[PDB]
Write a protein that binds this DNA or RNA. Sequence first.
RNA 1: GCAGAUCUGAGCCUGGGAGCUCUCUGC
Length: 91
Amino acid sequence: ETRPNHTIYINNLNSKIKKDELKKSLHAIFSRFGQILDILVPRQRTPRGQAFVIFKEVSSATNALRSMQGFPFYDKPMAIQYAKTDKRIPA
RNA sequence: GCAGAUCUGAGCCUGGGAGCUCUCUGC
């Protein structure tokens, strides 16, 4: 169960890409949709090609999810969903 | 505790990967 929120969850990412470059590249491509609060690439026991992009506005997440769904990124089609739980930290 | 680290540290769980623990580093 997911519903629109600030955070998109991306997998099927190319796991050979260095994490720093991956973050820069995700930021460059997804910043077009709106301001990004953070990009998380969680460390796991093995590389699994997963990341979260946290937008400042939900509409940005909505349009990013629609527009980039299945779009090639480093030669792999992105699989995007809304995050099950918003990663936004509104403190 | 917080933040980081493995196709370039490790053991598990899973067996169609949005899982757990450890170790190391800084604070």
